[PDB]
DNA sequence: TGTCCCTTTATCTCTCT
DNA sequence: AGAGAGATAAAGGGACA
């Protein structure tokens, strides 16, 4: 017999029960826990289903799933029910922060280390609990936390970094490795290659930060005379997420892409300067001619699609969908390029294909409006949120579809929409803002925290803002959102 | 195998002017 | 408004007990 048969039946038996009270988990939630936390995590969730759901902890189903769905998920579940009350009552963390720390591989370790080191990091090293939480909230959080305790002094004193920079480097998966590498390579990269400490911190502050720094050290000379790449270009490739893989792939593919396709080094660097830049470049090499053939898309448009995180996904999705979206849905190919040219272009493209008919027929939007909503980062999220909230926003709150479309049509559109839905009543009824004013605040990137800052100032007034009328606060919030409001308090 | 840690890739949100 | 940046998540490998 296949040995895993017994364990699979075990998994499936306990699985079916969890669909019952008090968690009621779907198949996706169940598969998720099984694939990352394994059967032990599934058995643990069931075993501790009642201890977590309500009294005392009051963890949602979602939160239980978030904790359970990682390597050692069973350990994190045991640790949370034990340490959540300690970290909340004795260190003043919110349950949300405890759950965030918990929801990574080795969550147990992170939680116990936060419990152990938060006092010394805050008192003796001058960090805030929020900074400690951020450091802890990644795989290997325990290692990062111990490494920050160990290295914060030498990094600030011997190497001139600020505590904020140290915290930023630590606040990535593998943070311990990046910190140790920065300690070693900061003088080398700064003195031999003329990089600013800020540039070094930028390269280091990514997952795989150790690899990106070591690859910059190794490849900077070669890249900056053989290829006539500037240091600024190499730093950009190394600091934007693509890191080590992106840098090595730029070395390989720059001449190929320029010579075979007529791209500039700037176009190649742009493609490279994203998460998964390696994947994007290789896909461009493959797919550009296929996309530009038969007088199809231009190289320029192919570059734009490629030049975002998930570029590879965007490119292949366009390849699969350009025909059906243009022909069956009636989009210009220029409209398809527009939707594709953002982080998560693939998600947005697939969501437009799925939801354009529904948004048009059931909600009365134009395809232009669907395209506009789709054409931002997280376009998929904004499109699904418009589908869900258009009727309550229009019918119960009185907004026009035009206003809903405007709110949705920025990065974070989903967040802006949910926050208007949530806060419009108290803003208008309780505080005398007009709906137009609420829509105006919400119709920018950062619409949600801009709205929340306004509500905070109207419900728990900070005297530092008291000289501003509601109208002036509205103008400020529209101009620069939460940050402008915060900046104004500081003076 | 279960748990911990690290790296890559992809997606989403907000800030900075 | 479009670059820059942080946050978050999925998924695979190394390491070890």
Structural tokens at position A239: 């600091």
Report if CB A29 to strand C is under 7 Å: no
Does residue A69 contact residue A41 with C-beta atoms inside 8 Å? Answer: yes
Q: What's the rounded Cα separation, in Å, for the pair A427 and A424? A: 5
Report if CB A37 to strand B is under 7 Å: yes
Which nucleotide in the DNA or RNA is closest to residue A248, CA to C1'?
B8
What HEC string does chain A produce? CCCCHHHHHHHHHHHHHHCCCCCCCCHHHHHHHHHHCHHHHHHHHHHCHHHHHCCCCCCCHHHHHHHHCCCCHHHHHHHHHHHHHHHHHHHCCCHHHHHHHHCCCCHHHHHHHHHHHHHHHHHCCCCCHHHHHHHHCCCCHHHHHHHHHHHHHHHHHCCCCCHHHHHHHHCCCCHHHHHHHHHHHHHHHHHHHCCCHHHHHHHHCCCCHHHHHHHHHHHHHHHCCCCCCCHHHHHHHHHCCCHHHHHHHHHHHHHHHHHHHCCCHHHHHHHHCCCCHHHHHHHHHHHHHHHHHHHCCCHHHHHHHHCCCCHHHHHHHHHHHHHHHHHCCCCCHHHHHHHHCCCCHHHHHHHHHHHHHHHHHHHCCCHHHHHHHHCCCCHHHHHHHHHHHHHHHHHCCCCCHHHHHHHHCCCCHHHHHHHHHHHHHHHHHHCCCCHHHHHHHHCCCCHHHHHHHHHHHHHCCCHHHCCCCHHHHHHHHHHHHHHHHHHHHHC
- What resolution in angstroms, rounded to 1 decimal? 2.0
* Distance measured from the CA of protein residue A437 to the C1' of nucleotide C15, in angstroms: 57
Report if CB A424 to strand C is under 7 Å: no
Q: What's the rounded Cα separation, in Å, for the pair A432 and A61? A: 37
What method was applied to determine this entry?
X-ray
Q: Which of A337, A407, A345 is nearest to A373 (CA)?
A: A407
Q: What's the rounded Cα separation, in Å, for the pair A288 and A357? A: 30
Does residue A76 contact residue A67 with C-beta atoms inside 8 Å? Answer: yes
Structural tokens at position A482: 């939460």
Phi, psi of A224 (to 5 degrees): -100, 35
Q: What's the rounded Cα separation, in Å, for the pair A77 and A63? A: 10
Q: Which of A220, A168, A159 is nearest to A194 (CA)?
A: A220
* Distance measured from the CA of protein residue A483 to the C1' of nucleotide C4, in angstroms: 16
Which of the 249-288 residues on chain A come under 7 Å of nucleic strand B at their beta carbon? 274-280
Residue A134 sits at the vertex; the CA angle it makes with A25 and A447, to the nearest 5 degrees, is 75
User: In this complex, which residue's CA is closest to the C1' atom of nucleotide B13?
Assistant: A412
Which of the 413-472 residues on chain A come under 7 Å of nucleic strand B at their beta carbon? 413-416, 444-450
Q: How far is CA A91 from CA A28, A126, A129, A133, A362, in A?
A: 35, 15, 8, 11, 50
Structural tokens at position A56: 């005392």
Structural tokens at position A372: 């506009």
Structural tokens at position A447: 């619409």
Report if CB A315 to strand B is under 7 Å: no
* Distance measured from the CA of protein residue A174 to the C1' of nucleotide C14, in angstroms: 13
Report if CB A8 to strand B is under 7 Å: no
Structural tokens at position A182: 């920065």
Residue A22 sits at the vertex; the CA angle it makes with A19 and A26, to the nearest 5 degrees, is 30
Which nucleotide in the DNA or RNA is closest to residue A246, CA to C1'?
B8
* Distance measured from the CA of protein residue A5 to the C1' of nucleotide B13, in angstroms: 43
Which nucleotide in the DNA or RNA is closest to residue A201, CA to C1'?
C5
Which positions of strand B lie within 7 Å of protein CB atoms? 1-17
Report if CB A484 to strand B is under 7 Å: yes
């Amino acid at each position: 017999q296949w040995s895993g048969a017994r364990a699979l039946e075990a998994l499936l038996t306990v699985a079916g029960e969890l669909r019952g009270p008090p968690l009621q988990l779907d198949t996706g939630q169940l598969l998720k826990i099984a694939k990352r936390g394994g059967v032990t995590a599934v058995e643990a969730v069931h075993a501790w289903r009642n201890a977590l759901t309500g009294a005392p902890l009051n963890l949602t189903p979602e939160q239980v799933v978030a904790i359970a769905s990682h390597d050692g998920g069973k350990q994190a579940l045991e640790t949370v029910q034990r340490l959540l009350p300690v970290l909340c009552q004795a260190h003043g963390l919110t349950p949300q922060q405890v759950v965030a720390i918990a929801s990574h591989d080795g969550g147990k370790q992170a939680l116990e280390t936060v419990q152990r080191l938060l006092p010394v990091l805050c008192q003796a090293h001058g960090l805030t609990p929020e900074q400690v939480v951020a450091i802890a909230s990644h795989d290997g959080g325990k290692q990062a936390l111990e490494t920050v305790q160990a290295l914060l002094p030498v990094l600030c004193q011997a190497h001139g970094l600020t505590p904020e920079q140290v915290v930023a480097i630590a606040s990535n998966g593998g943070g311990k490795q990046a910190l140790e590498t920065v300690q070693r390579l900061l003088p080398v990269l700064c003195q031999a290659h003329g990089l600013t400490p800020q540039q070094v911190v930028a390269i280091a502050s990514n997952g795989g930060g150790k690899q990106a720094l070591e690859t910059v050290q190794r490849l900077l000379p070669v890249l900056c005379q053989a290829h006539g790449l500037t240091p600024q270009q190499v730093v950009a490739i190394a600091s934007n997420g693509g890191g080590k893989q992106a840098l090595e792939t730029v070395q390989r593919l720059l001449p190929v892409l320029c010579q075979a396709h007529g791209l500039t080094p700037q176009q190649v660097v742009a493609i490279a300067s994203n998460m998964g830049g390696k994947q994007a470049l290789e896909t461009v090499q493959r797919l550009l001619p296929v996309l530009c053939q038969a007088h199809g898309l231009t190289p320029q448009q192919v570059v734009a699609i490629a030049s975002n995180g998930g570029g590879k996904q965007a490119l292949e999705t366009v390849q699969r969908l350009l025909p059906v979206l243009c022909q069956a849905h009636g989009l210009t190919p220029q409209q398809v390029v527009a939707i594709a040219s953002h982080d998560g272009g693939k998600q947005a493209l697939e969501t437009v294909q799925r939801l354009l008919p529904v948004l048009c027929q059931a909600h009365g939007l134009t395809p232009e409006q669907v395209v506009a909503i789709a054409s931002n980062g997280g376009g998929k999220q904004a499109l699904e949120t418009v589908q869900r909230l258009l009727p309550v926003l229009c019918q119960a709150h009185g907004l026009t579809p035009e206003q809903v479309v405007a709110i949705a049509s920025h990065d974070g559109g989903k967040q802006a929409l949910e926050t208007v839905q949530r806060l419009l009543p108290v803003l208008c009824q309780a505080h005398g803002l007009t709906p137009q004013q609420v829509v105006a605040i919400a119709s920018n990137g950062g619409g949600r925290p801009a709205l929340e800052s306004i509500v905070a100032q109207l419900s728990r007034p900070d005297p530092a803002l008291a000289a501003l009328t509601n109208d002036h606060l509205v103008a400020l919030a529209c101009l620069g959102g939460r940050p402008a409001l915060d900046a104004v308090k500081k003076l």
